[PDB]
Each structure stands twice: as C-alpha cells, then as structure tokens.
Design a binder for this molecule. Structure first.
Ligand code: K
Ligand code: K
Ligand code: K
Ligand code: MG
Ligand code: MG
Ligand code: MG
Ligand code: MG
Ligand code: MG
Ligand code: MG
Ligand code: MG
Ligand code: MG
Lengths: 48, 175, 122, 205, 175, 110
RNA sequence: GGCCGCGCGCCUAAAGGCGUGUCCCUCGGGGCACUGCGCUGCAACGGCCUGCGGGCUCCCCAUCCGACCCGUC
RNA sequence: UAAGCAGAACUGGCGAUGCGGGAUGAACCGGAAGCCGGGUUACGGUGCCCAACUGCGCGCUAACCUAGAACCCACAAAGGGUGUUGGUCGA
RNA sequence: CGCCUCGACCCACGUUAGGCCCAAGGGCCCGUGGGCCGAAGUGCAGCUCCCUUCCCGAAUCCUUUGCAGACGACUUAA
C-alpha cells in the first residue's frame, strides 16, 4: 500500500498549530520545530 | 576359513612329546574369603592385522589429533600394532610418531624407503619417561627428502594439509 | 521442425540404468514406449524410450541387420569418436575422469588451476 | 521426502511456474529440518485446474466463518504470498513450538524485493510445471486467482517487476561483454603458460 | 518374466474300470508351477470330469520363446467375467516374447475393463503375420520407414546420487 | 579471500531430523540423521561405524570452555535415500533436532 | 549390538608360524594320524582424581513423543 | 416395511485386555503382554502433517456438480449421455 | 516527521510442439600456514609420545471545561 515518502515543513509555524504537538503547552519550553527552522537560515540547510 | 585343528595330530608341534610325569610346583595372613589367586594369563592375543592398502613408504593423511590433515609418509608397523610415521619434520613439521591404524587414510601414492634405516624406532623408544631424539629425526629426513625430491611436486604435496571443500564427498573420492 | 527422431538407424544414449552411458542403435520399434536396440557388445533387446536419449548421429541400416552388418555400419558411419569428440559425449568422458583422479593428481590439478587462474587475471 | 541437506544460511527459491502444493510440500520439509527458505515471485505460482475450479474452491473457503463472531473465524488472505504462507502452514505441525519455529524460517514475497533481486534464486525440479503437468491440461497463476478474489496490488507488483527486469537486462548486457573479455584473456593466458597446463587437458569439458 | 507358459499333462487315476486312462494336456499361463498345476486341475474338473483327488499329475514343462530377439505380432483370444455377464474378446499385441504379450493382456484388461486375473480365461494364443493383423495401433507400427519424435522425455538424474533439491536454472529439453 | 576460523575440515556436516519413530510412538535410543552428499542407502555403508559429535554451547564454563560435546556413531541406513540411524552415549535432547552434527572418518577401513 | 574363560615341560623365530617318524593317496603337495601326565579369571594405551571435575534416584524449567476424572452401577 | 428392533443355531470375540493399524471408536484387521538390548515381521503404509520412494512400468479419467481417493464404514437407485476408451454382431 | 531528561563464493529475461543445450552433474577462489533509472538496506615446528568442540526535553496527577462521561477514558484551558 501507500507509504509516506518524506515531508517538508514551512519556516514559520504559528503557536496555534504548534500547540497541537503538546499535551501541556504552558508547562513546556515550546521547542517544537525550533531547530528545524534553522535549515531556512543557512545554505546547507536550504540545500536539504 | 582354514581349520588349524582339522586333524587330531597335535604332534607336528611336539614331535618328541613322549615325556614323563609332570612335577607339580606360610601365607603370613589368611584373607577370610576364598579368593582365587591372580596369576599371569597364558593367552596370546594374536597381533593386529595391518590394512592391506598400507605398505612401507605409502602416504597417509592424518584424520585426528593436532596433526589432522597432515599428509605423512608411512614407514613401519610396530610390534604393538601402531604404524610408525614421519612427516618428515622438515616439510610439514610432523616428527617421528606412532599412529593407530584408524585415524589415518592410506592413499595410493608411494615412496621407496628401502635404503632408509628405521630399526632403533620401536615401542620402547616411545616409552613415557630429547637432544638425541632431535638427532635421530635429523638423520631420518635427509635420508628421505631426496626420495621426496625424486618425484615431481611430491614435496609441496607432503607440505600441504588435506581438507574437504564445498561439494566434496569422502565416499566418492578415490584416495 | 524437430531435430531428433527415433527411426531405424538412430544412435541413442542409455540414461538411467546399469547400462548408463552406453551407445545403442535403434533397429526396430515395438510400440510408442519401446524399441529394439542393438549394440556391438550386447544381445538385441527391447528398451523403454524413457531410458533413451537420442543423439544427433544416425547410421544407415535395414530393419534387422545381422551383428556383422551392424558393426560395419557403425564403422562406415564413424560413430564412436563422433560421439566422443562432441561436447555432449565428452562431458560423460571427463565426468568419469574427474572421479577417477586420486589425491595426488587432484593436488596437481589444483596447482595447475591456480597457475592458470592467475594468468587470466594478469 | 527428506531435506535438501545443503546446509546454507538461506536458500532463495524463484517460485515462478511451480505447482503450488508440490512447492509447499518441499518447502515445509526444509523448514521443519532447520533451513531458512525465502520464496519470491509467489504471484506466478501455478495450480492445476484452471481459474474456474480454483476460484470456486476459494469461494467455498470464503464461505467458512464463525457464525457468532467472524473476526474469530477463519482468516481468508487474498495476497499470493499469504496464500502460499497458509498452504505451507497446513503442512506443518504449527500448534507445536517446533512447527512455530519452522514457520518462522519462511519468508514469502510477491515479486522480487531487495536484496534478493541481486542474489541467486533456485528452482525445485520436482515442483516445476514443465515437468509436472501435461502440456494440454488447464492451470492458473496464483496472482490471477488472487486478483479475482480481492487482491488489489497486482498493478504495483507488475510495475515494480518491469522496472526490475529492465535493470537486470542492462546488467546482463554488461556481463556478456565481460565474458567475451574473459574468453580472450584465457586464450592469451593459455599459450603464455601452455606447458604448465598439460594435466588439465583431459578434463577440459 | 512375470508370466510363464507351461505344458501340464495328467490323467484320471488308473482304476480297474479302465487301468489305461486317457491323457490330457494343457498350455497354461501362470506365475510359477504350483499355480499352473492348480489352474490345470481347475479346468480338468470343469471341462472333463477329473478332479485332483481322482487324478494323477504326469508332467509339467515350461515353454520358452524360440527367438526372444525379434518382434512378433501376438493375438490372444480370451474369456473374461465382467460385473454383469461373461464376454469373449480378441486382443493383439507386439512383443519380443509371448510372455510379454500375456503380461500386456493382463495389464490392459485391468485398466480398460477393471478385470482381475481370476476372472480371465485364455482361450487361445497365436502369432499373426503382419499381413493378417486386425487391430489398429498394431498396423501403424508395421511402417518400415517408421519415424517420430519422443514427446515425453522424463528429465531425471541417472543414478540417484546426482539428485539435488535445488537447481540453478530451469531444465532445457527439446525433441 | 582472507577468512578466519578453522583451517581444515575433516568432517562432513549432518543434520538431526528426529528419532526412530512410528505414527504413534518414538524412541530416543536412536536418532535419524541426514548427511550432506549421501543420497542412497548403498553409499551409506561407507559411513557405517563412523564417529559423530554433537556440539552445543552450554550456559556455564566447564573446563574454561562454554562448549559441550556428545559423541555417537552411525549405526545403519534408514530408508532408501541416505538417512541414517545414529546411537549416542546419551540420547540427544529433542531440542537438538534440526541442528548440525559433525560426521568424522576416525574409524577408517580405507 | 552384547561377551572376555590355548599354552608349556624341543629348538629357532619380535610375533603370527616353522621344524619328527609311520602307513596310505595319487600326477606335482598334502591327508588321516603319534596321545602322557600337569597347571589353567584376553589384552594395549590415554586423560582425571578436591577442580569452572564426576555423579544423582532430589528440586525447577525447556523441548519431542504419549497422555480425557477418579470412585460406582 | 424397517430399525443401532425383537427372538433362536454353531463358533469366535468384547465384557475381564492392554499393544500396532482402520484420522476417531468395547466388538473390525493384526496380535495378545514380566524389566530390557539388538535383529525382523503382521495389519497398514512410503507428497507434507508422519517414520518410510515425489521409486521403476502400462493404461483409464478431466468432473464449467465440492471429480476421486482404505473391509466393517459412515449410503445411493430405476433410467439416461453424438464425453471418451475397449469389445461383439451385422449391412 | 518533531522534540532530547567453518569456502556460509555466484543477480538473465523467457521457452519447453523450443531456445551449442541433453540439469550448479557448472564455474570461481593459493584450495597449500556519485548516481540508488525509492519495493530501499548490515544497498550499489617435537615430549600435546595413540581421539577428547579444530573455543576465534517531555509525559502523568491535583485544578478547569462539557463538543465527553457509570467509573476510567475523551475534547479544552492553565
Ligand atoms: K452407582
Ligand atoms: K459409455
Ligand atoms: K521519533
Ligand atoms: Mg518422512
Ligand atoms: Mg473483505
Ligand atoms: Mg460386568
Ligand atoms: Mg466395563
Ligand atoms: Mg527391536
Ligand atoms: Mg509419481
Ligand atoms: Mg473412517
Ligand atoms: Mg446407467
């Protein structure tokens, strides 16, 4: 059957959608996609 | 299937056997039980038969022990029945040894050893009890290396170990 | 267009038997499964086609040749070495030869094969 | 029937044009004896009797179902590899720990997935259709039966298999060039060491 | 050969009524002599009125093929019992011996009509010239230019030592 | 190729198939063994009387070694197809069926 | 697979074995035989012996085979 | 009418009896028995389950009805077929 | 996808009423001490005296909700 090949996310994700990745948003450091966003800054990251 | 005692002769052994009456031959302790005394046994156990494919100077593959697979030349069959073998010690590093008739395989390759003296080698020589042994080994190879050099490729053959490889059936191989 | 037929004069190889590897000539056909076969070294007998492999050789004879007539055709048609010089007949020959080799000859074949193999690579 | 005796790490069998129950019989003996068997191309296994007889046999099997709880009842697999897996299981004491271990040594695939596309695939002589079936009698392919009863990955199997055969055809062309080079090399190396290889002449094939 | 032809000779027991009774001979097909004599006494009881208890067995001799290297055409007239009734039929065979034809006849009756050996009576056997053969599949093998291919080869190893479970490629066979 | 491990091989590999059996009871006093390359009852006679070793790894050390050995010999053929009957000093564990055994040539008639 | 009760009072020979006389048998070489008293548990070699060694009828577990709950009418 | 029904004659069996085969089963087939080692058989089998040939040989069958496939035994009939294969007697 | 307390040697498709063949019954081996033409992956010398295995940052609970609910669970907020 069908299989997920890969996924690419945008550089800016609102905190409304980033809350979906947490059971307790206000107790966390809110680190989701913080390092993924760094690919859009460098040049090797943009190559990926 | 010969009948040795086929005839009631018994006199071809003792022809002059008409002889006279036999003369029959403190304990310090009595064992309290009638134990029949143990005397030495007067039975001759008919020494072992050599395999008809093993003849002096034939080559043997060793099947077990620390020298398993060593291709070795056969010299003599000892009184106990163990075969006498040498490597020789120069080519494959196998010294003079006595091996059981089992644990060896007699190949069809032969070497002449007629002018080689193997007399002082016998069961007493191997009694569990070395410089002179190095001399005897040294003086028995140089009498045998040349005859090995006489046949082409026999030196590299004796210096290699036998092994079975993929698809090898020991019950079909000629050796 | 088939290549090999059974008819009078076809030379066949006996497979699957005590007589395996021997050459026989089809001299008569009994029925759909059996044929009369005659050879230089055996008395004529019927054989199952299930135990016969037809070769590419075919000799000239009549239905029931005498033994002398059969020998002559097997010479006028040079069959023994035509079988042996073909690759098919050669394969049976060296299969016997390889099995017959003893330990010393097999060690020398190994020495030659290693020499031959290293030369191809070079 | 006893085992192969070949004592390898795993044997890969190309299942194309084998009879289903004769292939499963031999494989089951191999697994029970301790061999790992990988069967590929289970979509091209053959069963005697054409599509019609084989299709209604499955439909009768599809009828069987626990009346009070069907998810407990017989499980009817539709893929060719799971069909062959269940045929083999029927020939194994699978409710014992020995048969449980035996069936865990079997891998069955549709098509030839990696890494077996680059390994050697054998055949079973006494399961091949060309030696087992008269040329006029009916038969069907496992993938055709599976497609008729619910299998839906026949197209992706076919598309993948065409891609694999293209790559193998290119690797075959390259291997033929290297073989012609090899024959020239053994010809030139034959004279350069002509004297040494005299003992190899009578066993040359 | 499975079946043998025997000539069985016997008579009624010499009694003061006759004291030189008539001699009866039969040619019977059986697997050994004991089964040939039993079948002889079966027919003597049913055809004549002499049974084994009132009779004498004189001779029993096996008949052999004159030329077991040629191919003859063999006609057989037989009587057999089916599930409902008795019927007689004529069969033709090609063999190097009449023994093979009788084995062929018994095998064919077992296959085509499910008739076992006890329910068969060989009325008559003979050799037929190829000009006078009646059944098809015997005349079609009278072609002197007979030619055909082998449409079923039975690919197999020769001596069961070369048997392997796996092979690297599919067999190539042609005719 | 540069490989490691054993340098020579003076044994053939056998696989344990099970026990002397009928449809309804089994006998541990003899094991059934398939030897590689032996395909007929006739060529089994070469191996009759040959010594056999079953090698397995235990859980503790015994002589600074973690491997144990059980010795047996080939006794007779079993069937027409090369399978043989083997007698070991102790009966083989049923867990050993499907595993490998080493068939030597130590008692040699040739 | 289970068992371990000829040899010497003549010589030579590792040892198996050979070596005397008599009558007969033929076709080269044997055969049947002299019969007198005694004594009369087959061997060779190896590893190990206080140790992570050997054994076990004891305990637990695994596997293969076999196995339905006793008493009663 | 029949019945795994009801009643007699001769013998065997089960009951009182395990063991091998008939998938299973008081009675069918084999065979009866102290605790064991080795060899061989009976009945029944040799594709897998399952120990033993995918053994050697000749025919017949094609089941679009769940073709068919082990005494007791686990059913089938009268009647049909230009399915196919053997025969017999005729124009 | 995000977030971090015992030499284990060997890749043709396809067909058998056809493609020299007639089974790997072969061959090989000192055998001797950046694209993955994405189905994705472990990818392309003795005496050791005659056998003893050949040892290789979050989550959860207390709080909240009522789009949920017998209790757990669930959708929310903190
Ligand atoms: K009661
Ligand atoms: K009809
Ligand atoms: K993750
Ligand atoms: Mg079996
Ligand atoms: Mg569904
Ligand atoms: Mg009672
Ligand atoms: Mg009772
Ligand atoms: Mg017994
Ligand atoms: Mg068959
Ligand atoms: Mg039944
Ligand atoms: Mg009718």
């Amino acid at each position: 059957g069908l299989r997920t090949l890969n996924s690419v996310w945008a550089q800016h994700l609102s905190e409304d959608v980033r809350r979906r990745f947490y059971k307790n948003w206000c107790k966390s450091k809110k680190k989701a996609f913080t390092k993924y966003a760094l690919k859009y800054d460098s040049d090797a990251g943009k190559k990926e | 299937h010969t009948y040795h005692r086929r005839g009631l002769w018994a006199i071809k052994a003792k022809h002059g056997g008409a002889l006279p009456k036999a003369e029959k031959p403190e304990p310090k302790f009595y064992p309290a039980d009638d134990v029949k005394p143990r005397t030495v046994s007067t039975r001759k156990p008919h020494p072992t038969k050599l395999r008809s494919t093993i003849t002096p100077g034939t080559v043997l593959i060793l099947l077990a022990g620390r020298y398993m697979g060593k291709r070795v030349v056969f010299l003599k069959q000892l009184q106990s029945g163990l075969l006498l073998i040498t490597g020789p010690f120069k080519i494959n590093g196998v010294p003079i040894r006595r091996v059981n008739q089992a644990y060896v395989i007699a190949t069809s390759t032969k070497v002449d050893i007629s002018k080689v003296n193997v007399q002082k080698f016998d069961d007493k020589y191997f009694a569990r009890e070395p410089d002179f042994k190095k001399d005897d080994q040294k003086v028995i190879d140089a009498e045998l290396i040349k005859a090995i050099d006489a046949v082409p490729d026999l030196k590299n053959y004796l210096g290699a170990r036998f092994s079975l490889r993929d698809g090898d059936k020991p019950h079909e191989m000629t050796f | 267009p088939f290549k090999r037929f059974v008819e009078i004069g076809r030379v066949a190889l006996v497979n699957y038997g005590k007589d395996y590897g021997r050459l026989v000539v089809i001299v008569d056909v009994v029925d759909q499964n059996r044929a009369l076969v005659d050879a230089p070294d055996m008395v004529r007998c019927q054989m199952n086609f299930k135990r016969l492999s037809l070769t590419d050789i075919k000799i000239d004879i009549k239905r029931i040749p005498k033994k002398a007539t059969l020998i002559k055709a097997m010479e006028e048609a040079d069959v023994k070495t035509k079988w042996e010089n073909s690759s098919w007949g050669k394969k049976l020959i060296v299969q016997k030869k390889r099995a017959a080799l003893n330990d010393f000859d097999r060690f020398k074949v190994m020495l030659a094969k290693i020499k031959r193999g290293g030369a191809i690579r070079q | 029937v006893s085992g192969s005796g070949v004592c390898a790490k795993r044997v890969v069998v190309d299942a194309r044009h084998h009879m289903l129950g004769r292939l499963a019989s031999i494989v089951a003996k191999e697994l029970l004896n301790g061999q790992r068997v990988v069967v590929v191309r289970c979509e091209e296994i053959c069963m005697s009797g054409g599509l019609v007889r084989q299709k209604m046999k499955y439909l009768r099997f599809l009828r069987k179902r626990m009346n009070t709880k069907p998810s407990h009842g017989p499980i009817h697999f539709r893929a060719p590899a799971k069909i062959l897996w269940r045929t083999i299981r029927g020939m194994i004491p699978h409710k014992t720990a020995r048969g449980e271990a035996a069936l865990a040594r079997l891998k069955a695939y549709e098509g030839v997935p990696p890494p077996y596309d680059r390994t050697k695939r054998m055949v079973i002589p006494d399961a091949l259709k060309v030696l087992r079936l008269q040329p006029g009698h009916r038969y069907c392919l496992l993938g055709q039966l599976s497609k008729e009863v619910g299998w839906n990955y026949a197209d992706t199997i076919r598309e993948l298999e065409e891609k694999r055969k293209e790559k193998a055809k290119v690797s075959y062309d390259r291997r033929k060039q290297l073989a012609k080079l090899r024959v020239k090399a053994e010809k030139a190396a034959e004279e350069k060491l002509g004297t040494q290889l005299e003992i190899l002449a009578p066993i040359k094939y | 050969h499975r079946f043998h032809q025997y000539q069985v000779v016997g008579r009624a027991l010499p009694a003061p009524g006759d004291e030189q009774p008539k001699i009866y001979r039969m040619k019977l097909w059986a697997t050994n002599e004991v089964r040939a004599k039993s079948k002889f006494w079966y027919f003597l009881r049913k055809l004549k009125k002499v049974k084994k208890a009132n009779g004498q067995m004189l001779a029993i001799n096996e008949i052999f093929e004159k030329n077991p290297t040629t191919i003859k055409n063999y006609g057989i007239w037989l009587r057999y019992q089916s599930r409902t009734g008795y019927h007689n039929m004529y069969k033709e065979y090609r063999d190097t011996t009449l023994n093979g034809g009788v084995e062929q006849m018994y095998t064919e009756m077992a296959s085509r009509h499910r008739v076992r050996a006890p329910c068969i009576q060989i009325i008559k056997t003979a050799t037929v010239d190829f000009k006078l053969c009646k059944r098809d599949n015997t005349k079609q093998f009278h072609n002197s230019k007979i030619k055909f291919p082998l449409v079923y080869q039975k690919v197999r190893p020769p001596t069961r030592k070369l048997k392997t479970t796996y092979k690297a490629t599919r067999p190539n066979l042609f005719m | 190729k540069g490989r490691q491990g054993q340098r020579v091989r003076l044994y053939v590999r056998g696989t344990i198939l099970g026990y002397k059996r009928s449809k309804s009871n089994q006998y541990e006093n003899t094991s059934l063994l398939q030897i590689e390359g032996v395909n007929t009852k006739e060529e089994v006679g070469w191996y009759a009387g040959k010594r056999i070793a079953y090698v397995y790894k235990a859980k503790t050390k015994s002589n600074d070694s973690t491997i144990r050995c059980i010795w047996g010999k080939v006794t007779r053929p079993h069937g027409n197809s090369g399978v043989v009957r083997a007698k070991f000093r102790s009966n083989l564990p049923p867990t050993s069926m499907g595993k490998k055994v080493r068939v030597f040539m130590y008692p040699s008639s040739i």
